[PDB]
């Protein structure tokens, strides 16, 4: 977790090298808060605010039967946005890898997925 946007969404980085979850808008509701915390000493969040993730959507109109695809201009714009993001990430991920790399298993622990064990009891669990 990085910071909480004004829209309310959570700002998020799986370190894209470790997780594969690159940089994400997420909802508070859809997540579980672990007591494991990594410091971001490299906090860059000022860069990123809501308007950062837009997207451009095709026109679904009553004359095309809401049958839509994106134009070439759109392919381009979106490609450019993507490269831009790829860049902006390393900025954030970079101090991250570092901070995370200094915590013993935290790299693997981040790489891993969270499953329930049969015997588990999510209602009494301590995270």
């Amino acid at each position: 977790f990085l910071k909480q946007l004004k829209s309310g969404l959570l700002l998020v980085t799986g370190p894209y090298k470790v997780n594969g979850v690159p940089l994400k808008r997420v909802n508070q509701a859809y997540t579980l808060s672990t007591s494991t915390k990594v410091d971001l000493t490299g906090v860059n969040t000022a860069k990123f605010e809501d308007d950062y993730f837009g997207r451009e959507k095709a026109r679904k109109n009553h004359k095309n039967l809401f049958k839509a695809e994106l134009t070439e201009e759109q392919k381009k714009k979106e490609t450019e946005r993507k490269n831009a993001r790829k860049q902006d990430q390393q900025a954030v991920d970079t101090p991250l890898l570092a901070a995370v790399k200094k915590v013993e298993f935290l790299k693997n622990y981040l790489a891993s997925k969270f499953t329930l064990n049969n015997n588990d009891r999510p209602h009494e669990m301590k995270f």
Partner: protein, 107 residues
């Protein structure tokens, strides 16, 4: 591939609808969540969203189908809870396992 990697849903059973000897409300299903035992523990799931998945002929390229609902309330003092779905669950469903999911996390 051997299995699905991570399944984050708790297993629930569909007991039946909420009923009296001669009468049944089919609006309220009853579930028993795995390793959920007393009213206290059931309460923990109060708002939670629960799914009913089943398979069938191809509908929009997916061979499965779904009914979504929420556990609302503790039914009786062992672990049993009323669930409401969008479409009241079909009755053969009774023998079966439903997915309790942890999605509803709020402040």
């Amino acid at each position: 591939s051997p299995v699905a990697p991570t399944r984050l849903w708790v297993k629930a059973a569909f007991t039946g609808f909420r009923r009296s000897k001669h009468t049944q409300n089919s609006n309220q299903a009853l579930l028993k969540l795995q390793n959920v035992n007393t009213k206290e523990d059931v309460a923990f799931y109060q708002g939670k969203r629960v799914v009913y998945i089943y398979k069938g002929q191809k509908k929009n390229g997916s061979n499965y189908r779904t009914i979504w609902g929420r556990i609302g309330k503790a039914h009786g003092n062992n672990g049993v809870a009323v669930a409401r779905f969008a479409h009241n669950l079909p009755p053969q469903a009774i023998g079966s396992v439903l997915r309790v999911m942890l999605y509803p996390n709020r402040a």
